[PDB]
Design a protein around this ligand. Sequence first.
Ligand SMILES: CC(C)[C@H](Nc1ncnc2[nH]ccc12)c1ccc2c(c1)S(=O)(=O)CCC2
Length: 167
Amino acid sequence: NSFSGYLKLTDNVYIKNADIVEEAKKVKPTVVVNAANVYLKHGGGVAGALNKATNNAMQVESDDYIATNGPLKVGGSCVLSGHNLAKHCLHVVGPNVNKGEDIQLLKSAYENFNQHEVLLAPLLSAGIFGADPIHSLRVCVDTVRTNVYLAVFDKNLYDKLVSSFLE
Ligand SMILES: CC(C)[C@H](Nc1ncnc2[nH]ccc12)c1ccc2c(c1)S(=O)(=O)CCC2
């Protein structure tokens, strides 16, 4: 959990402009969060990047979990191996607003983080999931009580998020 160069927002929420994959290699976190979908198909974005960094081992393990347990629910999660990126990967399904899912489920999605003492995570439901990223940060700060290190891979968005928090 050797996090470096983060800006502390609250006593339990930190943020950095960085690729979560690059962070997981630098930090060696106990938990890395994946911004998953309900069938754990890691086809692009954050999930595709984390899977590629495991040379597809994450996808094979994910398909086996879905075979035995069935899909996740929106707002739910599961704990699987972290492979070479972390001890564990917490796969969390935030709502995809662009596909009609309820933004209120973003609180349930962040609540999964509270079962783990320290996490490296992306900004849930941002990017192509369509949630307003300033709203996602506000839900993160109001919901997560354990120690969360957010990696946001875009300097323009990072600057807007820090300026919004400090208003
Ligand atoms: C807002 C983006 C800059 C951010 N991208 C990232 N944030 C941190 N490490 C990253 N590695 C590669 C991309 C990447 C982001 C955060 C959350 C979501 C996505 C994107 S998505 O994949 O479009 C859909 C799922 C939710």
